[PDB]
């Protein structure tokens, strides 16, 4: 009676009527959310929602046809049961009996299946998103740096700062126009690298390691060009990331807005994170060889 009171009260308090329990028309998705893209080679590709929509439409059509003509109670009842089976699959396939397997090798992704789980829409496309202006590479120890310096390979820096390099080239008159500047940077002539070495400075980049257990996982550094193709990192801060050098890789994000770079200057700087917040003890003074 307590549970029954709880649910009954909900209907009583809220204007929505209970008749919504039993729907009467089935909404359809806008088509681009279920794209039937074209592939080279004469093949095709389609999201599985098309198949469920086709099944419900077909069964509803056949039920209509059988209802127009005088038909037995057995057949119409069977068809209505089939329609129920179809609409239910569209809301969530595999919640009853055996999941619609379709091709036979796997279940069919329904509407609910996209909103739930590790691969769901919530936990893969609203919290953790992909981002432009980023890179990654192996790391090697650099002892000649300071506590706020990291070495970026030439190619990585060039590809991260391409808009800024192009603007600088047009301002210095090395490049006649934006298109010609783009051509020159893609070609990669020495003037482009000189401009790049000029432009990267006084601009923080956020180095980050994959597990990122605690808030010292992302730290800002002032970049610096260097040959090769491996980032250079300051040994002292290595133990804070838990970054070995057996073989590792580190993401290098780039802040763009004025606020983002200001934040990376004031808060996330590698020099203002001496103390680990777990217990208020120093963490940036490793001990392996020194």
């Amino acid at each position: 009676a307590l549970k029954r009171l709880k649910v009954v009260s909900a209907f009583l308090q809220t204007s929505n009527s209970p008749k919504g329990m039993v729907l009467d028309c089935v909404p359809v998705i806008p088509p681009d959310l279920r794209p039937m893209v074209q592939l080279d080679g004469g093949r095709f590709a389609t999201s599985d929602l098309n198949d469920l929509y086709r099944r419900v439409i077909n069964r509803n059509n056949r039920l209509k046809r059988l209802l127009d003509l005088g038909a037995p109670e057995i057949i119409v009842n069977n068809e209505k049961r089939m329609l129920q089976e179809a609409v239910d699959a569209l809301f969530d396939n595999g919640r009853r009996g055996r999941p619609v397997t379709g091709p036979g090798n796997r279940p069919l992704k329904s509407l609910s299946d996209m909103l739930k789980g590790k691969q769901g829409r919530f936990r893969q496309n609203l919290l953790g998103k992909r981002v432009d202006y980023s890179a990654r590479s192996v790391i090697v120890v650099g002892p000649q740096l300071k506590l706020h310096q990291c070495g970026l390979p030439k190619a990585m820096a060039l590809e991260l700062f391409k808009p800024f390099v192009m603007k600088r080239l047009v301002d210095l008159n090395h490049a006649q126009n934006i298109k010609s500047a783009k051509r020159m940077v893609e070609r990669g002539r020495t003037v482009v690298y000189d401009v790049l070495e000029e432009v990267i400075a006084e601009h923080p980049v956020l180095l980050n390691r994959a597990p990122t257990l605690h808030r010292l996982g992302i730290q800002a550094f002032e970049p610096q060009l260097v040959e090769g193709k491996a980032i250079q990192i300051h040994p002292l801060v290595c133990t804070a990331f838990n970054a070995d050098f057996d073989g590792d890789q580190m993401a290098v994000h780039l802040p763009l807005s004025a606020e983002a770079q200001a934040e990376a200057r004031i808060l996330m700087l590698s020099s203002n994170n001496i103390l680990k917040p777990a217990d208020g003890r120093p963490v940036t003074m490793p001990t392996q060889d020194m």
Binding site: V37, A45, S47, D48, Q176, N177, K179, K182, R183
Partner: protein
Amino acid sequence: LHTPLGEDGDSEFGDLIEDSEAVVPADAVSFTLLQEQLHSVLDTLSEREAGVVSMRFGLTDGQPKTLDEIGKVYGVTRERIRQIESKTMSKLRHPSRSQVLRDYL
């Protein structure tokens, strides 16, 4: 598209093929700079020559207008309009007002 992509977990054939409708920001901004530079060189010429070339080639509306089609709002002849268009093409063909437009193609 929801096939395993040959991977038991974390993968879908639907997340490996790039689309084509998406506007490339690089091409879009290059086009915007082209539009601005062309409008600037167009203003550099006489305002009348500017206007007639703009209406002939339709630089303010998608569809261009025919020669005589320009001789109604501006009240000129189908052959006058052709003549000024020809001398506009002659001037713009001059290497002076071509270099800034060379790289744009």
